[PDB]
Amino acid sequence: KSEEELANAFRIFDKNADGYIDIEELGEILRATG
């Protein structure tokens, strides 16, 4: 459950060189969970 979920909420938002997330993508994560 938990393990899979993480990889997804990385990869969904995470367009560029993802191994990483940036500021806009960070905004998106915040928008998803609150």
Added chain:
Amino acid sequence: KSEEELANAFRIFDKNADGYIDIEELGEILRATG
């Protein structure tokens, strides 16, 4: 909530000071605020 406010949030999360967030760091963000 603003770009200015989010800059701080980014910094809080960006533990390893790389100007990015990664997979493990993402966990912390996802958890907030369930």
